[PDB]
Structures are given as structure tokens and as C-alpha cells.
């Protein structure tokens, strides 16, 4: 029936068929599809049709200090389409309109799907704050409110634990293998057993009972039997010992395992390898007063250490014995719940009784760095994780958008498909279309290139698509059609000039040919900027990048006729690199901008849009009027390491007509340069090549390519300095802003550390040992007073000065 065709539509939008039961050994996934029906219908029935249709992008945070200095005498100007109007920062849009009349029309941004509606002061609209930040004019058309009808929804024992290892079987690959069974709880290995080593052949039968030290009723929920094969670790797979019904897992299992590549979130999945033809299989059978002062000081010191400082045994004993004292310190919760013997039923009982009375945690102000910690790989207990989700519930949509990528990623750490976190994401995406757009694209990113989690993520994405309404479904469908067309063009063009050729006649020929052939997809929403709709292509402006991986430089017209400007929307389509790394780094940069805003700073970061759409394939926003610092060098002294340091300021002058425009660009440059210095330093991506640093004609600096990130702490070359002048008066400004921004980030050390380690676990595999994570703790001068930290950053600046083009000259000889 047509219901089946609708499920087909959903499948095509998802990129995976959630009704497939070809790679399941239980009904957990379908159980979750069924359990999600209620949160979906409940948020749908709960949301306001009008605000959900117009999706006003609002914030309750106060107006920053740097935006106030840009205001007139309590007088924001709104150009309505077409007269200008004075308005008070605290003037509601409704009051604005009733003032403009002296009845039901709504103000929509010109050239955008963005609306200034709701009982919010224009002070508090992100588009208005963005216009103020960039000194643009709030241009609005008096449109008629979109029909909410277009959002309508298609209505829907004391025995010890034993595991029998029968054997392993592969048709692939003189070695020797043994099997290893672990009872794991949140990366805590409760107990461990091994089989004897038998020669590695395509079939190894043990028929061996591995008896564990843990008793059946001490198994905690969320505990995993982790089965691994060693020759080095060759393969792994995981089975939940308590399923989604709290039933002890019994029966026969034949689990197709994951292969290792010669620690990260894939090693945790409960999913089995779908590739049953080539993948290693394993076969198994289951059948079953108050403290003294010195101790107070020690406990406080422990609670004070950072999220990476590991807890010794005595530390955990102290935290557990004084658990009720520790419960008053919400900052101690991550460490307290790591001091819990989860393999002991009585201790987990005491732990739940502890969580029972948590008035201090409930009342505390939301601390995201703490919530995230509780949501990471070190916490399986769903009750421990549910309090983090509880705190998350109080985030406004603006903050949800700030943290949505890494919350979605954090879903990879949930033991079960249906989690508090999953339902929270579902709710927030259904309540608000901007969150829903990005939830769609993030879930789909992972569903398109992760067998390890595509099933769970596909269940969540289907749950979302069944409540977002048919309008947004049509939008997603158009977008997916367009992106698939364009990825087809990208790959087919990549095939045509594989290596060692810059650009051919035939190449540009075929590219323009296909783009002309493809345009006969009328209009689609820009995935990295859902307020922008792209129209026809500007075939004449589209080109093959002429990079190693020949990415596509495409440009579209804006489909919105109310659009004021005539600028095209530029998108780069790239295949060959894993752009999820870029998504993560850019999202951390956005969090850094947010942190800086809390302290009335603006470092003019340009976190360009970037959506990973598949396996080593994605799109990148084209910042208009931007060029590489390397290219500005080459243009005046081409193919030479001389790197004449006077050239950047000459270029700035050239592109800025008015000396005043030049000074504005120089100040923009001071700020954006300080911001990128601090950010790349903290993240350990500051030692980049001249070619991966771009600048807008208006002086805004910004880095690109966060996959190719490999000595110097960051890039502060003699040419940036010449744009500053070297001591000088603007270089003093640079150092001042840098110390301020660095200290501002050190004020959120914990959040930055948890986000960084999460990125390491969920982005690219690389090394991702403890060692990679520790660098950031170092760069944030953990356990240091702010004075020494400012000294540390100024020492980094001085190393930059001393090295000169040595760094850049070697980057040039190397590339
Ligand atoms: C160790 N090793 C052997 C490997 C191992 C594995 N591995 C990866 O698998 C991998 C994963 C992710 C990335 N990530 C990535 O590549 N990200 C990106 C790259 C370029 C751009 C760009 N590039 C240009 N061009 C360059 C030159 O001048 C200008 C043109 N322009 C723009 N702009 C957009 C904004 O507006 C202005 C134009 N963006 C934007 C993003 C790379 C590689 C790591 C390396």
C-alpha cells in the first residue's frame, strides 16, 4: 500500500533500510523503532504549529559588549520592503509591525528562509546580532506567515557466569590465535578469560567453557561480553549480557566480527559486521560522622583534578567512602561514579540509592563540560547518563545547536539503541527545524559511512523523519537528490584526470558539459546553511579545483528573488578525504567563539560550513573573496621560498580602496589572527602550511583543511607581523587579545578537554591513545596560575618570531 511507498521514501532519505533484519541477533533495533513512536508523537502534538513553521532563531544570552558599542542611541534600523524604521533593541517584532502600521503579516529576512517572529526583543535574534556584528542592514520583507498545514504529519543466580566458545571461522588469510572474553562495563574490564592457543586455520573449534569470576546477579546492565581474537588483536565483537528487556542473554550466537586496521568508538558497538561473506565469525553459547580535615583536603584535591587525571585505587576508595560528601560537589560526579565497583550488585544498589537523593546536582547550574563527561565512553550505567541528559534538557535551542554534533556522536557511547540521549536529540530536532535539519545531516553522515553504528543512527533518523512534517521531508528529498547528482559528477570527473595533471581542456569541457546536462532539481536548501536556498547553477563559474583530488568548485544563484545581493552561493564538493574531522574541528571552533562571547570577545573566526555526506565525500562552503596566504606570496614572488614578508599588507592595500577600509581590514586581521593563533594552539593544529591559511579581502584570516594536520606552536610569520609592524601598537593589541582569549579558554579547560577526547574517539582513528589527548591538557597549562599561563602564551609568540620562515620555508621544501 501507499504506507509501504512512504517507508520506501523514508529509506531513500535515510540511506539505510531500518526494516531490514538481515544483520540482527535480536529485536533491539525494532524494539527501539517501537519505543520511539511515543516521544515522536508527543513532541509533534506538543509543538506550536506557527513557531515550528517559522522557526525563529532566538537566544536568551545577553547582547554582547562588542555589539552594544555598535548600536546607536537605543536605535536599531530595520529596512522593511521599502522604508527604513528606527526601533528599540527591546522592541518585539509584533510591536515593530504594529508601529509600522500606525495586521497578521510577518517580517522575513530578505533572500532567506528566516523570520523575525515571537515575543523576543530584536536584541535577541541571531540574524540581527549577525547583522550588527558584520555592520550590515537588517533588510526584511513584510511577507505572509507560512501555512502550518504544510508541516502536517502522516499519522502513525549465584552461579558464576560462563560462556561457551565453540569456535571461529573465516575463509580468508603459519600463525596462532586465541580468543579473549571480557566482561566490560564502560571500558572497565570486570573480569577476563582466554582460550588456549590453537593454530590459525579457517576453522578453529574450542568447545570450551570459559568460566568468569563474576556471579550472574552481579552483572550490571549495559555490561558487554567483548570477544576478541589474538594472533596482536585481529578481530573483535560485542554482545550485551543484559538486553533491552533486562533479560539475561541466552542461546546460541554466531557473531560476525569487525577486523582491526594496522581506543575509538567503533570498538564499542553492539552491531555485528554485515559482511557475512568475508568477515571472521565467532560462535558461542550462553545458558545460565563527617570527615577529618586532612581527608576533606585530599577529597577536594581529587575532585579538583582535570578529566584526564586518572584516579588511583586509594583515590577511588576515598571517593566511595565519602560518596555522600562527594555528592555535594557536582564537579566530583564524573570521578565519583568512576569509583563504583559496577561488578558488584550491592555496590550498584548503594549507587542508585545515592543518585536517588541528588538535590545538589538537580539544583546546580548546567555545566556542559560535566554533562559531556558523564555522556562519554567511561559511563555505561544508563541512570548515571540520564542525569547528564537531565541537565541537557535545560539548554536553549541555540546551545543545542552549539553542541549537537558531539551529542549525536556521543550516541555512539550509549550501550543501548534507545537511550535518554537518543530521545533527547529526537525531541529537540522535532521541536525546532534548524536543529532538525542539522540532526538529519549529522545522522545521515554517520549512516552513510559507518557500519558500526548505521543501524542505530538509522533508527533514530527514521524516528525523526516520521515527525518533522511533509514540508521538511520534501526539503530533505530535494537536498539529497541534488547532493547525489553532484557527488556523481564529482567522482566521474575525478576519474578523468587521476594524477599528475593540473587541468585539461577536456576536463573543463566535460565538467561544464555535465553541469549543463544536469540542469535539465529546481531549487534546494543549502545543507550547511538551511536559511539559504540555491537555484540554477552558474555553469560559467564552476570549475575543477585543480587539487590533488580534483574537487569541484560549484556556484549557484540564490533561488530567493527577495535576495538583495547578486552573489552566488559557492560550494566545494570533495571526494578523497574524511570531512567528519573538519566538521568536528569547526564545531569546536564554534564552541570557542561561544566561550569568547561569554567574556565579551570576538576573534572573527570563519568556521566555514562543512557537511560530510558520505564515505570520504562532502561539501564545503566557499568563503567569498578569500585567497591563500601562500598564493598572495606566490603572486609577487612565485615558486620561491624567499617569502617576502612585505607582500600581505601590499595585497590588503590593493584590495581595500579606502585607507579606512584598509585599517578596518587590519583590525579584523589582528583579531582573527589572534583567534586562530589561540585556537590552533589549544587544539595542536597551529603548525600549518601557508597554503592552508586563507584571508578575506577584508582582512579576516582563517584556516582550512583540518585533516592534513601533520616545529612551531602556531603560524605567526614575519608577513603577518609586517601587517602588524615589527614591537608596534597593533602587535601589543595582538598579544593582549591572545592572552585574554587563551585565559578565557582555560576557564573552560574541562569542556575543551572532554570535547577534544570525544573528537579523538569519534572522528578519525589515527592513533587515539592517551598520549594524543594529553597535548591539550599541556597547552591549557593545567594546574597553573593565570600569570604563568600568559607567560607561556607569550613564549609561544616569541618562538613564532624566532623561527621566521624556517617553518614556512620547510613547509615549502616539503610541499
Ligand atoms: C596523514 N595523511 C597521509 C592523511 C592520512 C588520512 N587523512 C584523511 O583522510 C583526511 C581527512 C580530512 C581532511 N580534511 C580536508 O581536507 N578539509 C578541507 C580541505 C581543503 C579545503 C579548502 N581548500 C581550498 N583550496 C586550497 C588552495 O587554495 C584555495 C583552494 N579552498 C577552500 N575554501 C573554502 C572556504 O572558502 C574559500 C575556499 N577550502 C577545505 C577543507 C583531509 C584528509 C589525513 C591525511
- Look up residue 425 and give its three cell numbers: 536529540
Would you put residue 55 in left (φ > 0), alpha (ψ -120 to 50) or beta? left
Q: For residues 615 and 580, give the distance between their C-alpha atoms in angstroms, rounded to a whole number.
A: 10
Task: Tell me the three cell numbers of residue 151.
Answer: 508541516
Specify the residue with its C-alpha closest to ligand 1, atom 3: 708
- Please report the atom of ligand 1 found closest to the CA of residue 616: 9
Residue matched to cell numbers 558464576: 160
Distance 620 CA to ligand 1 centre (A): 9
Which set of grid coordinates corresponds to residue 791? Answer: 607567560
Q: Which of 569, 693, 694, 706 to mutate to test the pocket of ligand 1 (most atoms within 8 A of CB)?
A: 694
Cell of 212: 568468569
Could you tell me which residues come within 8 angstroms of residue 244 by beta carbon, excluding any fewer than 6 positions away?
Answer: 26, 28, 31, 32, 416, 417, 418
- Tell me the C-alpha to C-alpha distance, in Å, between residue 28 and each of 24, 271, 382, 428, 463: 8, 11, 16, 23, 15
SS3 788: helix
Which runs of E-coded beta strand occur in 671-791?
Answer: 693-696, 701-703
For residues 358 and 387, the answer to whether their CB atoms sit within 8 Å is: yes
Residue nearest to atom 15 of ligand 1 (CA): 705
**Hey, what's the cell of 34?**
517501537
For residue 411, which phi and psi values (nearest 5 degrees)?
-60, -25
CB 85 within 8 A of CB 78: yes
Task: Determine contact, residues 234/260, Cβ cutoff 8 Å.
Answer: yes
DSSP label at 468?
Answer: S
186 carries a ligand binding annotation: no
Give CA separation, 610 vs 441, 481, 571, in Å: 11, 18, 9
CB 596 within 8 A of CB 550: no
Q: Where are the beta strands (DSSP E) in 433-515?
A: none
613 annotated as a binding-site residue = yes
Q: What are phi and psi of 492, to 5 degrees?
A: -65, -30
DSSP 569: E
- Rounded to the nearest whole angstrom, what is the distance from the C-alpha of residue 624 to the centroid of ligand 1? 17
CA 505, CA 493: separation in Å to the nearest integer? 13
- Interior/surface letters 567-585, b for 16+ CB within 10 angstroms, e for the rest: ebbbbbbbbbbbbbbbbbb
The span from the CA of 50 to the CA of 155, in Å, is 19
- CA-to-CA distance for 119 and 116, rounded, in angstroms? 10
Is 611 among the annotated ligand-binding positions?
yes
**Eight-class DSSP state of 115:** B
Question: Nearest-CA neighbor of 167 among 152, 155, 179, 157?
Answer: 179
Work out whether the CA dihedral 633, 635, 639, 645 comes out positive or negative. Answer: negative
Exposed, middle or buried by CB within 10 Å (0-12, 13-18, 19+), for 171? exposed
Category of 585 on φ-ψ map: left (φ > 0), alpha (ψ -120 to 50) or beta? alpha
Cβ atoms 86, 71 nearer than 8 A: no
Which of 541, 545, 550, 572 to mutate for ligand 1's pocket (most ligand atoms within 8 Å of CB)?
A: 572
d(CA 404, CA 744): 22
Cβ atoms within 10 Å of 660's Cβ, excluding its own:
9
94 is in an annotated binding site: no
Dihedral of alpha carbons 727, 732, 738, 744, sign:
positive
Q: Which residues line ligand 1 (CB under 6 A)?
A: 572, 577-579, 581-582, 608, 620-623, 626, 628, 691, 694, 704-708
Rounded-to-integer distance, Cα 190 and Cα 207, Å: 23
Nearest to 750 by CA among 372, 384, 385, 401: 372
Q: How was this structure determined?
A: X-ray
Q: What is the DSSP string of 501-516?
A: ----HHHHHHHHHHHH
Number of C-beta neighbours around residue 46 at 10 A: 10
C-alpha cell at 787: 600569570
CA 815–ligand 1 middle distance (angstroms): 15
- Compute the distance from residue 576 Cα to the ligand 1 centre, in Å: 10
Contacts of residue 98, Cβ cutoff 8 Å, sequence gap at least 6: none
Q: Is 397 exposed, middle or buried (0-12, 13-18, 19+ CB in 10 A)?
A: buried
Burial class (CB in 10 A: 0-12, 13-18, 19+), 1: exposed
590: CB partners within 8 A, 6+ apart: 402, 605, 607
Angle at 474 between CA 468 and CA 475, to 5 degrees: 85
Q: What is the 3-state secondary structure (H, E, C) of 614-637?
A: ECCEEEEECCCCEEEHHHHHHHHC
| Residue 63 CB partners (closer than 8 Å, separation 6+) | 89, 123, 124, 129
Torsion of CA 686, 691, 696, 697, to 10 degrees: 130
617 CA from centroid of ligand 1 (Å): 12
The answer on whether 693 is annotated among ligand-binding residues is no
Q: Are 344 and 787 in contact (CB under 8 A)?
A: no
How close is the Cα of 706 to the center of ligand 1, in Å? Answer: 6
> Which residue from 693, 695, 708, 709 has its CB within 8 A of the most atoms of ligand 1, so it is best to mutate?
708
CB 381 within 8 A of CB 342: yes
Q: Tell me if 705 is assigned to a ligand binding site.
A: yes
Contact yes or no for 485/477 (Cβ under 8 A): no
Q: Which grid coordinates are listed for 442?
A: 549529522
In degrees rounded to 5, what are phi and psi of residue 696? Answer: -80, 155
User: What would the grid cell of residue 781 be?
Assistant: 597549562
Taking alpha carbons only, the member of 617, 391, 298 closest to residue 487 is 617
Residue 75 and residue 100 in contact, taking contact as beta carbons nearer than 8 Å:
no
Please name which of 394, 424, 395 lies closest in space to residue 410, comparing C-alpha atoms: 424
What the block records as the C-alpha cell of 793 is 602564551
d(CA 603, CA 597): 9
Residue positions counted in the chain: 815
**Distances in Å between the alpha carbon of 599 and those of 386, 595, 741?**
30, 7, 9
Given a contact cutoff of 8 angstroms between Cβ atoms, the answer to whether 549 and 577 are in contact is yes
CA nearest 526: which of 429, 610, 633, 643? Answer: 610
**In this structure, is the dihedral angle defined by the CA atoms of residues 813, 618, 376 and 219, taken in order, positive or negative?**
negative
Beta strands per DSSP E along 195-257: 198-199, 203-215, 224-230, 233-240, 251-256
Neighbours of 679 (CB within 10 A): 25
Pairing of strands 138-143, 76-80: parallel
Identify the H or E element spanning 78. Answer: strand 76-80
What 3-state DSSP class applies to 553? strand
Q: How far is ligand 1, taken at its centre, from the CA of residue 325, in Å?
A: 50
Instruction: Give yes or no for a contact between 768 and 757, defined as CB atoms under 8 angstroms apart.
Output: no
Contact between 94 and 542 (Cβ < 8 Å): no
**CA neighbours closer than 13 Å in the CB half-sphere of residue 328:** 6
Question: Is 681:696 a contact under the CB 8 Å cutoff?
Answer: no
The cell numbers describing 49, all together, are 504549529
- Cell numbers given for 645: 614578508
Which of 591, 742, 724, 609 has its CA nearest to residue 668?
Answer: 724
- Cα–Cα dist 518/537, whole Å: 10
Pocket test for ligand 1, best of 573, 576, 618, 620 (most atoms within 8 A of CB): 620
Angle at 751 between CA 748 and CA 752, to 5 degrees: 85
Q: How far is the CA of 98 from the centre of ligand 1 (A)?
A: 49
Torsion, Cα of 459, 461, 462, 467 (10° steps): 130
SS (H, E, C) 405-425: HHHHHHHHHCCCCCCHHHHHH
Beta bridge partners of 285: 164, 252
Q: Which residue has the cell 577600509?
A: 661
C-alpha–C-alpha distance, residues 714 and 301, integer Å: 33
H or E element: which one contains 613? strand 610-614
Q: How far apart are the C-alpha atoms of 240 and 242, rounded to whole Å?
A: 5
Backbone angles phi, psi at 281, to 5 degrees: -115, 150
Cα 717 to ligand 1 centre (Å): 21
On whether the CB atoms of residues 518 and 485 are closer than 8 A, the answer is yes
Beta partners for 115? 108
Q: Residue 466 carries which DSSP code?
A: T
Q: Which of 423, 420, 465, 470 is nearest to 447 (CA)?
A: 465
**Nearest ligand 1 atom, CA 764:** 11
- Alpha helix stretches (DSSP H) within 639-715: 647-655, 659-683
Q: Which three cell numbers stand for residue 22?
A: 538481515
Q: Whose CA is nearest to atom 45 of ligand 1?
A: 708
Phi then psi dihedrals of residue 530, to 5 deg:
-65, -10
Question: Is 612 known as a binding-site position?
Answer: yes
Q: Is 577 flagged in the annotation as binding? A: yes
Q: Which of 302, 368, 306, 369 is nearest to 339 (CA)?
A: 302
Q: 202-238 in b/e burial notation, b at 16+ Cβ within 10 A?
A: eebebebebebebebebbbbbbbbbbbbeeeebbbbb
Amino acid at each position: 500500500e501507499e504506507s509501504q511507498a512512504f517507508q520506501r521514501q523514508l529509506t531513500a532519505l535515510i540511506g539505510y533500510d531500518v526494516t531490514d533484519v538481515s544483520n540482527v541477533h535480536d529485536d533491539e533495533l525494532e524494539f527501539t523503532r517501537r519505543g520511539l513512536v511515543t516521544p515522536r508523537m508527543a513532541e509533534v502534538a506538543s509543538r506550536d504549529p506557527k513557531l515550528y513553521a517559522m522557526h525563529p532563531w532566538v537566544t536568551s544570552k545577553p547582547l554582547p559588549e562588542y555589539l552594544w558599542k555598535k548600536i546607536a542611541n537605543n536605535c536599531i534600523f530595520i529596512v522593511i520592503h521599502s522604508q527604513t524604521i528606527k526601533v528599540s533593541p527591546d522592541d518585539t517584532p509584533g510591536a515593530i509591525l504594529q508601529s509600522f502600521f500606525t495586521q497578521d503579516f510577518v517580517l522575513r529576512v530578505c533572500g532567506r528562509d528566516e523570520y523575525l517572529v515571537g515575543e523576543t526583543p530584536i536584541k535577541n535574534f541571531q540574524w540581527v546580532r549577525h547583522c550588527l556584528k558584520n555592520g550590515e542592514e537588517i533588510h526584511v520583507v513584510l511577507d505572509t506567515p507560512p501555512d502550518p498545514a504544510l508541516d502536517e504529519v502522516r499519522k502513525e543466580c549465584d552461579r558464576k557466569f560462563r560462556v561457551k566458545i565453540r569456535g571461529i571461522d573465516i575463509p580468508v588469510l603459519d600463525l596462532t590465535v586465541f580468543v579473549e572474553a571480557n566482561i566490560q562495563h564502560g571500558q572497565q574490564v570486570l573480569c577476563q578469560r582466554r582460550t588456549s592457543p590453537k593454530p590459525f586455520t579457517e576453522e578453529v573449534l574450542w568447545n570450551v567453557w570459559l568460566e568468569f569470576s563474576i556471579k550472574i546477579k552481579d552483572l550490571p546492565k549495559g555490561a558487554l561480553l567483548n570477544l576478541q581474537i589474538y594472533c596482536q588483536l585481529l578481530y573483535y565483537v560485542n554482545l550485551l549480557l543484559i538486553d533491552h528487556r533486562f533479560l539475561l542473554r541466552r542461546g546460541e550466537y554466531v557473531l560476525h566480527m569487525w577486523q582491526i586496521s594496522g581506543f575509538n568508538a567503533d570498538k564499542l558497538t553492539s552491531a555485528t559486521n554485515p559482511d557475512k561473506e568475508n568477515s571472521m565469525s565467532i560462535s558461542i553459547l550462553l545458558d545460565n560522622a563527617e570527615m577529618p580535615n586532612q581527608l576533606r583536603k585530599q577529597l577536594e584535591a581529587i575532585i579538583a583534578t582535570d578529566p584526564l587525571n586518572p584516579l588511583t585505587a586509594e583515590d577511588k576508595e576515598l571517593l566511595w567512602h565519602f560518596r555522600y560528601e562527594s555528592l555535594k560537589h557536582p564537579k566530583a560526579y564524573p570521578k565519583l561514579f568512576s569509583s563504583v565497583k559496577w561488578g558488584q550488585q550491592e555496590i550498584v544498589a548503594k549507587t542508585y540509592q545515592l543518585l536517588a537523593r541528588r538535590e545538589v546536582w538537580d539544583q546546580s547550574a548546567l555545566d556542559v563540560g560535566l554533562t559531556m563527561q558523564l555522556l562519554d565512553c567511561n559511563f555505561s550505567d544508563e541512570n548515571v547518563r540520564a542525569i547528564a541528559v537531565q541537565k541537557l534538557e535545560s539548554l536553549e535551542d541555540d546551545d543545542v545547536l552549539h553542541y549537537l554534533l558531539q551529542l549525536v556522536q556521543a550516541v555512539k557511547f550509549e550501550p543501548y539503541h534507545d537511550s535518554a540521549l537518543a530521545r533527547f536529540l529526537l525531541k529537540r530536532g522535532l521541536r525546532n527545524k534548524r536543529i532538525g535539519h542539522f540532526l538529519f545531516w549529522f545522522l545521515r553522515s554517520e549512516i552513510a559511512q559507518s557500519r558500526h553504528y548505521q543501524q542505530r543512527f538509522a533508527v533514530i533518523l527514521e524516528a525523526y523523519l516520521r515527525g518533522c512534517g511533509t514540508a521538511m521531508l520534501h526539503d530533505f528529498t530535494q537536498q539529497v537528490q541534488v547532493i547525489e547528482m553532484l557527488q556523481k559528477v564529482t567522482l566521474d570527473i575525478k576519474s578523468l584526470s587521476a594524477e599528475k595533471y593540473d587541468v585539461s581542456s577536456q576536463v573543463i569541457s566535460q565538467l561544464k558539459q555535465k553541469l549543463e546536462n544536469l540542469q535539465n532539481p529546481e531549487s534546494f536548501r543549502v545543507p550547511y546553511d538551511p536559511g539559504l536556498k540555491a537555484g540554477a547553477l552558474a555553469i560559467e563559474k564552476c570549475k575543477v579545483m585543480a587539487s590533488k583530488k580534483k574537487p569541484l568548485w560549484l556556484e549557484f544563484k540564490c533561488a530567493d528573488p527577495t535576495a538583495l545581493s547578486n552573489e552566488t552561493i559557492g560550494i566545494i564538493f570533495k571526494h578523497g578525504d574524511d570531512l567528519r574531522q573538519d566538521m568536528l574541528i569547526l564545531q569546536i571552533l564554534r564552541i570557542m567563539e561561544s566561550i569568547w562571547e561569554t567574556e565579551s570577545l570576538d576573534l572573527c573566526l570563519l568556521p566555514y560550513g562543512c557537511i560530510s555526506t558520505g564515505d570520504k565525500i562532502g561539501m564545503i562552503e566557499i568563503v567569498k573573496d578569500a585567497t591563500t596566504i601562500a598564493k598572495i606570496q606566490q603572486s609577487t614572488v612565485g615558486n620561491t621560498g624567499a617569502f617576502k614578508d612585505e607582500v600581505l599588507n601590499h595585497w590588503l592595500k590593493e584590495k581595500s580602496p579606502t585607507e579606512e577600509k584598509f585599517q578596518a581590514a587590519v583590525e579584523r586581521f589582528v583579531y582573527s589572527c589572534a583567534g586562530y593563533c589561540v585556537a590552533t594552539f589549544v587544539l595542536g593544529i597551529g603548525d600549518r602550511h601557508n597554503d592552508n591559511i586563507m584571508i578575506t579581502e577584508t582582512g579576516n584570516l582563517f584556516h582550512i583543511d583540518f585533516g592534513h594536520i601533520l616545529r612551531v606552536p602556531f603560524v605567526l610569520t614575519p608577513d603577518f607581523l609586517f601587517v602588524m609592524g615589527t614591537t608596534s601598537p597593533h602587535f601589543q593589541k595582538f598579544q593582549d587579545i591572545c592572552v585574554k582569549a587563551y585565559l578565557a579558554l582555560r576557564h573552560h579547560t574541562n569542556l575543551l578537554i572532554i570535547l577534544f577526547s570525544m573528537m579523538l574517539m569519534t572522528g578519525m582513528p589515527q592513533l587515539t591513545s592517551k598520549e594524543d589527548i594529553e597535548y591539550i591538557r599541556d597547552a591549557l597549562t593545567v594546574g597553573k596560575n593565570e600569570e604563568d599561563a600568559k607567560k607561556y602564551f607569550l613564549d609561544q609568540i616569541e618562538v613564532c618570531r624566532d623561527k621566521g620562515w624556517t617553518v614556512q620555508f620547510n613547509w615549502f621544501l616539503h610541499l
